[PDB]
Design a protein around this motif. Structure first.
Motif, PDB file in Angstrom:
ATOM      1  N   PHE A  27       0.819  -1.208   0.000  1.00 58.52           N
ATOM      2  CA  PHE A  27       0.000   0.000   0.000  1.00 58.52           C
ATOM      3  C   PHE A  27       0.856   1.264   0.000  1.00 58.52           C
ATOM      4  CE2 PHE A  27      -1.871  -3.441   2.429  1.00 58.52           C
ATOM      5  CZ  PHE A  27      -3.078  -3.644   1.794  1.00 58.52           C
ATOM      6  N   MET A  28       2.110   1.131   0.424  1.00 60.23           N
ATOM      7  CA  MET A  28       3.006   2.279   0.526  1.00 60.23           C
ATOM      8  C   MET A  28       3.583   2.694  -0.822  1.00 60.23           C
ATOM      9  SD  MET A  28       5.092   2.070   4.118  1.00 60.23           S
ATOM     10  CE  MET A  28       5.743   3.698   3.759  1.00 60.23           C
ATOM     11  N   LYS A  29       3.975   1.720  -1.640  1.00 61.92           N
ATOM     12  CA  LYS A  29       4.549   2.020  -2.950  1.00 61.92           C
ATOM     13  C   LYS A  29       3.575   2.798  -3.829  1.00 61.92           C
ATOM     14  CE  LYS A  29       6.619  -2.117  -3.331  1.00 61.92           C
ATOM     15  NZ  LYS A  29       7.861  -2.237  -4.144  1.00 61.92           N
ATOM     16  N   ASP A  30       2.282   2.520  -3.677  1.00 66.33           N
ATOM     17  CA  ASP A  30       1.252   3.274  -4.386  1.00 66.33           C
ATOM     18  C   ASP A  30       1.337   4.746  -4.012  1.00 66.33           C
ATOM     19  OD1 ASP A  30      -0.194   1.953  -6.324  1.00 66.33           O
ATOM     20  OD2 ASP A  30      -1.621   1.060  -4.914  1.00 66.33           O
ATOM     21  N   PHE A  31       1.462   5.009  -2.714  1.00 66.27           N
ATOM     22  CA  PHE A  31       1.589   6.367  -2.196  1.00 66.27           C
ATOM     23  C   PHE A  31       2.740   7.111  -2.866  1.00 66.27           C
ATOM     24  CE2 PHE A  31       3.158   9.599   0.668  1.00 66.27           C
ATOM     25  CZ  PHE A  31       2.016  10.200   1.148  1.00 66.27           C
ATOM     26  N   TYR A  32       3.794   6.380  -3.215  1.00 66.39           N
ATOM     27  CA  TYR A  32       4.945   6.966  -3.893  1.00 66.39           C
ATOM     28  C   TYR A  32       4.618   7.308  -5.338  1.00 66.39           C
ATOM     29  CZ  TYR A  32       8.093   5.703  -0.061  1.00 66.39           C
ATOM     30  OH  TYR A  32       8.712   5.600   1.159  1.00 66.39           O
ATOM     31  N   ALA A  33       4.019   6.346  -6.033  1.00 61.80           N
ATOM     32  CA  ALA A  33       3.776   6.451  -7.466  1.00 61.80           C
ATOM     33  C   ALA A  33       2.798   7.566  -7.822  1.00 61.80           C
ATOM     34  CB  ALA A  33       3.270   5.121  -8.007  1.00 61.80           C
ATOM     35  N   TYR A  34       1.676   7.646  -7.113  1.00 65.71           N
ATOM     36  CA  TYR A  34       0.674   8.647  -7.468  1.00 65.71           C
ATOM     37  C   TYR A  34       1.051  10.028  -6.940  1.00 65.71           C
ATOM     38  CZ  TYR A  34      -1.607   8.145  -2.784  1.00 65.71           C
ATOM     39  OH  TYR A  34      -1.891   8.113  -1.437  1.00 65.71           O
ATOM     40  N   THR A  35       1.857  10.075  -5.885  1.00 63.65           N
ATOM     41  CA  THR A  35       2.373  11.351  -5.400  1.00 63.65           C
ATOM     42  C   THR A  35       3.343  11.912  -6.432  1.00 63.65           C
ATOM     43  OG1 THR A  35       2.221  10.556  -3.106  1.00 63.65           O
ATOM     44  CG2 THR A  35       3.472  12.580  -3.489  1.00 63.65           C
ATOM     45  N   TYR A  36       4.004  11.014  -7.156  1.00 66.93           N
ATOM     46  CA  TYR A  36       4.992  11.410  -8.151  1.00 66.93           C
ATOM     47  C   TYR A  36       4.357  12.153  -9.326  1.00 66.93           C
ATOM     48  CZ  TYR A  36       9.001  11.158 -11.306  1.00 66.93           C
ATOM     49  OH  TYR A  36      10.038  11.468 -12.155  1.00 66.93           O
ATOM     50  N   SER A 101       3.005  11.634   7.493  1.00 68.52           N
ATOM     51  CA  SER A 101       3.486  11.543   6.116  1.00 68.52           C
ATOM     52  C   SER A 101       2.333  11.405   5.124  1.00 68.52           C
ATOM     53  CB  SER A 101       4.446  10.363   5.959  1.00 68.52           C
ATOM     54  OG  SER A 101       4.903  10.254   4.623  1.00 68.52           O
ATOM     55  N   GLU A 102       1.172  11.006   5.631  1.00 74.49           N
ATOM     56  CA  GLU A 102      -0.045  10.919   4.833  1.00 74.49           C
ATOM     57  C   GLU A 102      -0.401  12.259   4.197  1.00 74.49           C
ATOM     58  OE1 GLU A 102      -3.699  11.045   6.821  1.00 74.49           O
ATOM     59  OE2 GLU A 102      -2.863  11.178   8.848  1.00 74.49           O
ATOM     60  N   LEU A 103      -0.030  13.345   4.869  1.00 71.50           N
ATOM     61  CA  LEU A 103      -0.427  14.682   4.445  1.00 71.50           C
ATOM     62  C   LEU A 103       0.361  15.193   3.240  1.00 71.50           C
ATOM     63  CD1 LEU A 103      -2.195  14.727   6.960  1.00 71.50           C
ATOM     64  CD2 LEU A 103      -1.306  17.011   7.476  1.00 71.50           C
ATOM     65  N   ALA A 104       1.662  15.415   3.410  1.00 71.27           N
ATOM     66  CA  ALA A 104       2.432  16.092   2.370  1.00 71.27           C
ATOM     67  C   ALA A 104       3.079  15.146   1.357  1.00 71.27           C
ATOM     68  CB  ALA A 104       3.501  16.968   3.010  1.00 71.27           C
ATOM     69  N   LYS A 105       4.169  14.488   1.749  1.00 77.20           N
ATOM     70  CA  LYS A 105       4.942  13.672   0.812  1.00 77.20           C
ATOM     71  C   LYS A 105       5.788  12.597   1.491  1.00 77.20           C
ATOM     72  CE  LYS A 105       6.089  15.666  -3.602  1.00 77.20           C
ATOM     73  NZ  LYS A 105       7.075  16.460  -4.384  1.00 77.20           N
TER      74      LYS A 105
END
Length: 437
Positions: A27-36, A101-105
């Motif tokens: 679930f964390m890697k998704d947070f990276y990809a779409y934040t990108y 970390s949920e908030l910004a990046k």
């Protein structure tokens, strides 16, 4: 009793942070990809997301390497308990960093938080047995050999059951799981303050006799015993360079480097970091992985609560040999059931047994013993420098295995564990031919 047990519980916080990144990872890697692409606008390359996650995981043992270097000037200044308070209030910073970390990046609040939470662990891994060691009575001391190691194993288990698919491991809940590492830190910031200070530190470094005697009676007998921090001042300490230069200590230095590298390059943390991805990599259902890793940690604890008595009673050399051999044969049969998956459902049940059997074998000889031997086989003079060599080899080996393993199972596929068997074999040969009891 409870707060006495939770006093040295900084080892739990280390054990937590090791497996804390295994469960949420999906679930964390998704947070990276779409934040990108919410910033850049373009998708992140498939490799760079794998390169970026390898960093997230491997910054922790890297931070420990840096943090373990600072233990010298800190405890020589702040003291034992003093440093133990220092990193605790300093452990809240990376803790809330990941929680919010949920908030910004992720780019800062995770990766930069992981190295910062690693500094705390690598720092405490010294101070804690150091603080507990000076407080403990003369005769009864070494009962702490496997004791904090037990707490590391529990921290792993807790992170796994709290990292269960149902509880905190999911899209919305993972920051709570990561930030949960600060709770035992703020818990220790409560009970520890009224715990006694360091008698040896106060009498020698602080030069206060009244401060040393007062904390001693809680428990001039031990007071005069501390004059051994004077007698040892004249004996001095061997440097790190002179360690290699001495022909007397060469087969010692060579051994601990082999033991510390062999221990970590065995792929022991390659499991607890990547366990969810490891089981998925052979036979295990997407639902079953979160459940089976929790059991793997439970087994790990049961072996550790055993091996505490087993390590001293059964000998140093035999247990060491038996362990790396089990870890070797468990890698072959695994690489192994991974290789041919057409025999499913016969194969995957074996693979799971192989990971368990590996954990059992590593939790006897390979994990506990190497740290113990360094304290033994080295003289008081060369002991501080020997520790640093072993420590540096440990963290940096821990670093690289956490770094390269995603790329290994990507590149080598079902052959991922072949490189670990080669290590176990080479290590088992060395600890056979050279190392005696």
């Amino acid at each position: 009793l409870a707060t006495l047990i939770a006093a040295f519980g900084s080892s739990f916080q280390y054990g937590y942070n090791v497996a804390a990144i295994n469960s949420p990872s999906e679930f964390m890697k998704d947070f990276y990809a779409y934040t990108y692409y919410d910033r850049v606008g373009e998708y992140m390359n498939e490799f760079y997301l794998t390169l970026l996650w390898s960093v997230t995981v491997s910054m922790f043992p890297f931070g420990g390497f840096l943090g373990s270097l600072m233990v010298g000037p800190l405890v020589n200044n702040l003291g034992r308990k003093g440093t133990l308070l220092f990193n605790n209030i300093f452990s809240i910073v990376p803790a809330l960093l990941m929680g919010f970390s949920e908030l910004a990046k992720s780019f800062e609040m995770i990766i930069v938080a992981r190295v910062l939470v690693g500094i705390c662990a690598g720092l405490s891994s010294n101070v804690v047995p150091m603080y507990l060691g000076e407080l403990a009575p003369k005769n009864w001391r070494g009962a702490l050999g496997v004791v904090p190691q037990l707490f590391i194993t529990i921290g792993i288990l807790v992170a796994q059951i709290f990292g269960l698919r149902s509880l905190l491991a999911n899209e919305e809940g993972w920051p709570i799981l990561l930030g949960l590492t600060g709770i035992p830190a703020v818990l220790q910031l409560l009970f520890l303050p009224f715990f006694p200070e360091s008698p040896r530190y106060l009498l020698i470094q602080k030069k206060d006799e009244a401060a040393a005697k007062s904390a001693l009676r809680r428990l001039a007998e031990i007071e005069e015993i501390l004059e051994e921090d004077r007698a040892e001042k004249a004996v001095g300490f061997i440097s790190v360079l002179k360690l290699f230069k001495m022909r007397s200590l060469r087969w010692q230095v060579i051994s601990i480097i082999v033991l510390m590298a062999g221990q970590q390059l065995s792929g022991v943390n390659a499991i607890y970091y990547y366990a969810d991805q490891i089981y998925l990599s052979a036979g295990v259902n997407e639902d079953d992985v979160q459940y089976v890793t929790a059991g793997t940690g439970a087994v790990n604890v049961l072996i550790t609560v055993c091996a505490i008595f087993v390590v001293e009673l059964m000998g140093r050399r035999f247990l060491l040999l038996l362990g790396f051999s089990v870890c070797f044969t468990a890698c072959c049969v695994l690489t192994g059931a991974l290789a041919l998956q057409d025999v499913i459902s016969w194969m995957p049940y074996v693979s799971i047994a192989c990971v368990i059997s590996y954990v059992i074998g590593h939790a006897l000889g390979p994990s506990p013993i190497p740290a113990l031997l360094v304290t033994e086989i080295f003289l008081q003079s060369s002991r501080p420098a020997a520790y640093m060599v072993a420590g540096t080899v440990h963290w940096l080996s821990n670093f690289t295995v956490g770094l390269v393993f995603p790329f290994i199972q990507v590149g080598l596929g079902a052959y991922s564990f072949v490189i670990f068997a080669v290590i176990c074999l080479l290590t088992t040969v060395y600890i056979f031919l050279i190392i005696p009891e």
